[PDB]
Structure formats: structure tokens, C-alpha cells
Amino acid sequence: QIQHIAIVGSVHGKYREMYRQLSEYEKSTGKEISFVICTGDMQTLRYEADLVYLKVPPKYKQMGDFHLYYEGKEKAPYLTLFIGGNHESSNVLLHLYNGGFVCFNMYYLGVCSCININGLRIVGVSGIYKSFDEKKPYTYPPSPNDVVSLFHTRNYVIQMLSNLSQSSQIDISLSHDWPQGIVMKGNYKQLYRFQPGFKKDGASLGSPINKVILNTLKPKYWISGHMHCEYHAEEGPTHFIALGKIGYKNAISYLDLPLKQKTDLEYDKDWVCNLIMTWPAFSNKAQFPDLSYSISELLSKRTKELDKKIIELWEKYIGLKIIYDSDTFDIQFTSRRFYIEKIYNELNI
Ligand SMILES: [Mn+2]
């Protein structure tokens, strides 16, 4: 009993083409896709006004396909999970920094999070690395002046994710840009001949944030897009897989994993606990996180009984199953934060 998981690189707003490719797999092979994982550059523009938040070179200022799905004209055939890249409707993703459905069957994992599906634990890290923004807080509501900085990966996600492999392993981890250094742990020679532009960065190619996270959690798989190429490498127990951009053949691959239990998309318990316990750092809706707080210290307060109560409270107000919610994203921002704050305050601490 195996589950077939589609892994996708950069979409660049080409959804109909991606799904058309995907259905041509379930027929060319007769295999069934359990679900789809996308590693970024989703460009989830709802309508024209969102073009403001899409940082792209001029020739790529396009609406793409997403809005058809947002309108209901098109329907995603597979449950599709994704993180943010460097080309996004960044206002939408900020509204959903704590994750959310952008439309039917399309779930954004947020700035970072861990989810559960079919007995798997999947960790996501959105964005790309620029050193000058790694300590920048998020400002809310989103402003057009932040189009250039919103998609940069913050350092704080390291602390948010670091304890996640304490109780069980991490099956799959996603990022947009590559973990730094991992280019050297594969056939980088074969790569360079095909991508001469990568040679210059050397071992420094990729994100140091993702490097730390990979080393700390050592997932079974690490999947990245962004680099417009196919690539494999091995860092200890972790299989690295890089994917190209939709419209080209290196863009989609498939993971045939053992399916132990079929199980709906669910919030990860440990992630939920971290999410609740770090609330004080995120209590200012205008500017977060507040790094006068230590994410680590806040998370050191996790105890078994506390975790147990959190999961009970989460299950009550929100539910363990991640379900589709068609409320406008600004409502979902406020709503999820309302319940996070409620749960924390009920712990009495
Ligand atoms: Mn990219």
C-alpha cells in the first residue's frame, strides 16, 4: 500500500498547465495522486489589484491562472499544499501567515508550520534568504511599500521549527531556495555544466536559514524549487530534491511513499503547541514578531500537561482537521489570531 505524492517546483501562476500535467500522470500510469506539494512562486493573485504585491520583472507582471480557481471557474483536482516563494501575491500570504486555504484544495502552510497528512509530517519554510531582512519584523496590514521585503525568510522560523523532531521524525520539508551548502553534496559538476551561473556562489549557494533547519530536523526529504533545474543530493539521512519551473520537464516529480493510514489534512500537534506558546511574541497585530521576546525561552515553557491542554483547547475552538474556509483573508488573519490568543490566555501563565 503506497501513496503517490506529486512534488512541484515553481508554478509562476500556471495552474491549469500544472494540473493538466498532473492528470496526464494518473492516466499515463494509472497511478493515483494522494496529494500535491508545491515549493513556491505560486502567484496567488485574486484580482488585478493584487498585481501591486507581486514583485517580478516587468515582463512577468501577469495575472496568471490563480484567479480562475479563486472565482470557482476552475477547480483544483488534487489537494494542493504549498509554501511561498519570491514571486507571490505577498499581501494574501501575509494575511495567511498562520496558514490557510487560498481557495478550494489549495492550502498555504504560512510563513512556516508543520502539518499532518496520511501519517506524514510535513514542514514548510516560505520565502527566500536575504541577510538584510532576516531580522525585519512583519508589519500589518500589508503595504505596497513592502512588496520587496515581504517574501524574505526571517531568522525566527529557525526557533519556531527547531524542536519539531523531538517526538517523531519529519517526513518531508519544503523550502523555496536551497539549503546553503547542499549543492556540493550531489553531482554539482553535472549541475554546473548545465547551470554555469551557479559555480560562482560555490558552497554559499542557497539559504543559511534552510541549512540550519535541515541539519536540525534531518527530514527524510527536503524539497526545494526556485533554481530552474532538476537536482538530487544527499546530506546524511536527508534526500534533497530540487525542481524546475512549470512549463518545463524538470518541474514535476513524484514520491511513492508507504501509506500506513489514509488521513485527512490535519494541524500538527507540536506545531500547534509552539504556535500557542509563542503568542506573546505575536500579540501586536501591527508588528510581529516582537523579538524582545526569546522564541526559545517561550518554547522552553512547553510541558506535557500543558501541551495536552493546548491540543484539547485547539480541538474545541478550531478543530484538528484543516478545513476549507471561504472567509476573506483579512477575516481569517483576525480569526486565527483571536483563537490563538484565547487558548494562550486560558492556560493561565
Ligand atoms: Mn523563485
Author numbering: 5 to 353
What's written in the study?
The spliceosome excises introns from nascent messenger RNA (1) in the form of a lariat containing an unusual 2′,5′-phosphodiester linkage (2). Hydrolysis of this linkage is rate-limiting in lariat degradation after splicing, and is required for efficient maturation of many small nucleolar RNAs (snoRNA) and micro RNAs (mirtrons) that are derived from intronic RNA. Dbr1 is tuned to hydrolyze 2′,5′-phosphodiester RNA linkages in branched RNA and not the considerably more abundant canonical 3′,5′-phosphodiester linkages, although the molecular basis for this selectivity has remained elusive for several decades despite extensive biochemical characterization of the enzyme. Sequence analyses predict Dbr1 consists of an N-terminal domain belonging to the metallophosphoesterase (MPE) superfamily of enzymes and a C-terminal domain (CTD) lacking detectible sequence similarity to any other class of protein.
The α pocket cysteine of Dbr1 was substituted to serine to prevent hydrolysis of larger RNA substrate analogs, such as AK65, a synthetic, linear RNA that possesses the 2′ phosphate at the conserved branchpoint adenosine but lacks the 2′ nucleotide that would be present in the complete lariat branchpoint. The structure of the AK65•Dbr1(C14S) complex shows that the enzyme engages the branchpoint nucleotide in a C2′-endo conformation that, in concert with stacking of the adenine base between His16 and Tyr64, places the pseudo-equatorial 2′ phosphate adjacent to the metal binding center and within hydrogen bonding distance of Asn90 and His91. There are few sequence-specific protein-RNA interactions at the branchpoint, consistent with the need for Dbr1 to hydrolyze lariat RNAs containing atypical branchpoint nucleotides. However, a pyrimidine is predicted to be suboptimal for aromatic stacking with His16 and Tyr64, consistent with the reduced activity observed toward cytidine branchpoints. Conversely, substitution by guanosine could promote tighter binding of the branchpoint nucleotide through hydrogen bonding interactions between N1 and N2 and the side chain of Gln47. The structure also demonstrates that the LRL element unique to Dbr1 enzymes acts as a recognition module, with five of its residues (Ile132, Lys134, Phe136, Phe155 and His156) engaging the single-stranded arm 3′ to the branchpoint adenosine. The interactions between RNA and the LRL are stabilized by secondary contacts between the LRL and the CTD involving residues 141–144 and 290–293, respectively. In the other three AK65•Dbr1 complexes in the asymmetric unit, the 5′ nucleotide is disordered and not visible in the electron density maps. Thus, Dbr1 does not appear to recognize nucleotides 5′ to the branchpoint, but instead recognizes the branchpoint and flanking nucleotides directly and utilizes base stacking interactions between the 2′ and 3′ nucleotides to further stabilize the complex.
